[PDB]
Every structure is written in C-alpha cells, then in structure tokens.
Amino acid sequence: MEEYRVEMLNKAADGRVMAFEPAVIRAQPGDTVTFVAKDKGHNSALMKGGAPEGAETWKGKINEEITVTLSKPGVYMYQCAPHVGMGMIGAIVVGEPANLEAVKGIKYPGKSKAAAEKIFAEIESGG
Numbered sequence: 274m275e276e277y278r279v280e281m282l283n284k285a286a287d288g289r290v291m292a293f294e295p296a297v298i299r300a301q302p303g304d305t306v307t308f309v310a311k312d313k314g315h316n317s318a319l320m321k322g323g324a325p326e327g328a329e330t331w332k333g334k335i336n337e338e339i340t341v342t343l344s345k346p347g348v349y350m351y352q353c354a355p356h357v358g359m360g361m362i363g364a365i366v367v368g369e370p371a372n373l374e375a376v377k378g379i380k381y382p383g384k385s386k387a388a389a390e391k392i393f394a395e396i397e398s399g400g
C-alpha cells in the first residue's frame with residue numbers, strides 16, 4: 274500500500290486559483306489518498322457519477338483532512354463544493370482508467386468543465 278497526499282490550496286504552483294495539488298494522482302488498487310488543508314476553506318467530495326461502479330464514495334467536511342480508500346480500479350472525479358464553479362476539481366486514477374468515457378459525461382458546472390478537459394488530456398496524453 275502506498276499513501277499519497279493532495280493539498281487543497283488557494284494558489285497552486287502552476288498559477289491555478291482554488292486548486293488541488295497534484296490535480297491528478299496516479300495510484301494502484303488498495304492505495305490511499307489523504308487531503309491536506311494547507312489553505313483553509315476547502316473540502317474534498319466525490320462528484321455524482323464520477324467513480325467506477327461499486328466504489329466507495331466520500332464527502333469531506335470543510336478543512337477535514339480526509340483519507341480515502343481506493344479499492345476498485347478506475348478514474349475518481351472529485352470536487353471542492355465552495356470552489357467547484359471556479360474550477361477546483363481533481364482526479365484520482367486507480368490502476369487503468371476503465372471508466373474514463375463515463376466520467377467525461379458527468380455534470381461539470383462553471384469553470385470545472387475546462388478544468389476537467391485539462392485533467393482528461395493529462396491522463397490520456399500527458400499534457
């Protein structure tokens with residue numbers, strides 16, 4: 274088991290405002306990801322229909338440094354509720370992205386649509 278960290282930040286290294294860093298975690302089945310409240314006012318919650326079938330969901334409170342389990346392989350699309358409209362979403366890819374087509378079709382409100390397009394390009398082609 275590997276244990277990864279995703280920081281919830283107001284300002285990222287690459288200039289993003291309201292951002293999870295890294296935006297895309299590449300994990301294996303059984304690994305964990307812990308969210309870090311480096312800046313306050315953020316949360317982490319799984320987006321509706323943004324996980325592979327039968328996967329455990331999560332809905333972290335504001336400033337809650339929640340650790341999520343990643344048993345089933347696939348792409349997990351999650352968001353910050355306060356800043357999702359500003360584009361604050363992230364991805365956790367577990368094993369092979371089998372449900373990549375399905376997660377492309379979910380609801381991405383506001384600037385998270387452009388953020389999702391950047392995330393999907395990063396997973397598929399690297400950049």
Ligand SMILES: [Cu+2]
Pocket residue numbers: 291292314315316353354355356357361
């Ligand atoms: Cu936020």
